[PDB]
Amino acid sequence: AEVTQLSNGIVVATEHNPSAHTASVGVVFGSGAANENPYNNGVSNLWKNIFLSKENSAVAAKEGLALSSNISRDFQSYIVSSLPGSTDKSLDFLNQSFIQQKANLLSSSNFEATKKSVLKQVQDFEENDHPNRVLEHLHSTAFQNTPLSLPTRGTLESLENLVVADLESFANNHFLNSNAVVVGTGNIKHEDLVNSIESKNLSLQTGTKPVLKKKAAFLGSEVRLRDDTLPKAWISLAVEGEPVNSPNYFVAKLAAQIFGSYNAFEPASRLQGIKLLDNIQEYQLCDNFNHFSLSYKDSGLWGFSTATRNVTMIDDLIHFTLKQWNRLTISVTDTEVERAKSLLKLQLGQLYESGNPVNDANLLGAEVLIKGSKLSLGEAFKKIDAITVKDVKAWAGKRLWDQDIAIAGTGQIEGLLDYMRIRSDMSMMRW
């Protein structure tokens, strides 16, 4: 399905969907918040809001175009959406506003206003979005003193000292042909997109991105942000996981699907075939939880997140969930593996067939920027169907059984026990 060409230093990747009603083109760079430093943290967040500023969007609206941008730890993207008969109109807008003529966007009275608004978005996030700011501190403590520990939005102190010359420095080092992929998804054709870049002579700078010194290194630790005025307790807990291109990439995702997610107020979520629900529903230990498997270029995280109002029984919630992780290493049934196989395929099928061309562009560019190509959905289903119980036991034995953990929490967390008490629950003396 997907086609990738290297006509020049830039790479062109596409995904033709003839039964769609929109098209999207854009550029994805192989740099994110992991390519900054504590003192300029949030520069890549400021660049996203410059692309989506009022003056830039007014020009695109008059032509019937919509702008989208996303910042991650390993990549950032700038997308333009349009009707199927106006693909060359979007390529021209991307060229004249981003690839070249970037000084008018970076003008004064536009940098100042955009900077003032981003400072407000960051302050609100740090005071209202408790479940998401806890997951950001989990990265901060698991990979402390490392590129992989910097928040994707920046901090109030990095942004407050950012100045006029700081944004131009970053784009020189990172917005280059060797660091970029041009992506077209929706009702577009590979031949029609390549024939348009070769005519307009589109090209970025011809440098090379700097090479970092350190690498990602997991360290067992914890950070606690207690706040007795909040009504709940939010907690995140994880061990070291798998990076992308790991052989055990789908085993770790299947292992997270065995315990899944839960919502106390949804009647159908209380009937799921998860044995953990039998210990936590009698006394209402939590309101919701979800298990994840995050994968980056160098490392990853594997764990779960919870929000609860039962502040006097937090230890029971942590004790019971970790004792269920113990069964992956020693005793996990065939039915649990077969059920998780069917729910992982459904979950992946929804993510890669959402029908939104903007979502597909982000997933396509990020995959090509690392692996060089993109694995087919049918090929992924074959690998998922081949996992056995012996593969789960081997994986969990080396990653989960008696291993260090990282913990982050906020709210009413007086009932969360010490590190060593929680750490000692990662195995058991009975086996």
Partner: protein, 352 residues
């Protein structure tokens, strides 16, 4: 009983059953909310627990959604499991148990949570107030159940028999072989449903203009306006909604939200201003209504609207085709107004 589907080379399929049984057809306040929360409970041949456990091993999920026009039952699954989910959806509409202990243990507590999370948002409170004063009975009926009017188990049973008829539902599928779906629907329990009558009327809904309402609230302040729209003006107010929120308008920084809700016989236009300071809300709404009374040119926003329309109509299988090509100008006339929050410091209608 209309069946339609579109095929594709894709591993995931979706099946939806749309019933004209929304809150605008409710005999009692919240009777449609209680039937929606009662959907995937025990049936006469299978239990709720058995359905969840069996469907999980096959890779599928269920969902029931309620709005002012429809009750929708949705199933997302792997492609080859189509005949299993046709019978599962047919059994829900045919032989639901309606046990007395299921209402007190699962259905009533779930409806309390939906009402609790909607009474804390001032924008949702203001929208329901605008629907009430524009249309009084019908489209102005309350959406959720709050216990103001007593609804019993027999009322939910009676409402279901009225709406779950052969002539009052439509079946549609995505990534489904249309020839195969018709055969499975034909030999399922759907074909043995009663042939009742369609609840949708072909006339226009009576509306009222120049109304007002104020509600006290602890939190953010909200000011809103509402305009009933007929069938001929649907495209004009669709451009107006996208023009006001986009970057083509100077008023976009003062408008929190703006949208047009489209029905078969008309629609309603809504515009919201929300902030934690009452003085900011008061100054913004006055500037918005004074600028719209002078007039606007909605021509530069036609192409932008065409793209946004195709984005949200991608999933909808029955979208009404609008023109957008004959839209020139707009001029504000009469409208409804609602204020929620610090009402002792918000403007009145006569001051706008």
């Amino acid at each position: 009983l209309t069946v339609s589907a579109r095929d594709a080379p894709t591993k995931i399929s979706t099946l939806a059953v749309k019933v004209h049984g929304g809150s605008r057809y409710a005999t009692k306040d919240g009777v449609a909310h209680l039937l929606n929360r009662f959907n995937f409970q025990n049936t006469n041949t299978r239990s709720a627990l058995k359905l969840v456990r069996e469907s999980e091993l096959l890779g599928g999920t269920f969902k029931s959604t309620l709005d002012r026009e429809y009750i929708t039952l949705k199933a997302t699954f792997l492609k080859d499991d189509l005949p299993y989910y046709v019978n599962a959806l047919a059994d829900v509409l045919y032989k639901t148990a309606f046990k007395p202990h299921e209402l007190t243990e699962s259905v009533l507590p779930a409806a309390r949570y939906d009402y609790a999370v909607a009474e804390q948002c001032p924008v949702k409170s203001a929208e329901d107030q605008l629907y009430a004063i524009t249309f009084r009975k019908g489209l102005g009926n309350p959406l959720l159940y709050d216990g103001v009017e007593r609804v019993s188990l027999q009322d939910i049973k009676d409402f279901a028999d009225k709406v779950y008829t052969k002539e009052n539902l439509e079946v549609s599928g995505e990534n489904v072989v249309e020839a195969d779906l018709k055969r499975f629907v034909d030999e399922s329990l759907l074909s043995t449903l009663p042939a009742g009558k369609s609840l949708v009327s072909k006339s226009e809904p009576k509306f009222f203009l120049g109304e007002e309402n104020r509600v006290r609230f602890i939190g953010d302040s909200v000011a809103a306006i509402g305009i009933p729209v007929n069938k001929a003006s649907l495209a004009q107010y669709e451009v107006l909604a996208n023009y006001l929120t986009s970057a083509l308008s100077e008023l976009s920084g003062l408008i929190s939200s703006a949208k047009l809700d489209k029905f078969t016989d008309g629609g309603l236009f809504t515009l919201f201003v929300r902030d934690q300071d009452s003085a900011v809300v008061s100054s913004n709404i006055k500037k918005i209504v004074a600028d719209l009374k002078k007039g606007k040119d909605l021509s530069p926003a036609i192409n932008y609207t065409k793209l946004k329309n195709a984005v949200q109509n991608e999933s909808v299988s029955s979208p009404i085709e609008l023109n957008f090509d004959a839209v020139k100008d707009f001029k504000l006339g009469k409208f409804n107004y609602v204020a929620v929050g610090d009402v002792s410091n918000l403007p009145y209608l006569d001051e706008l």
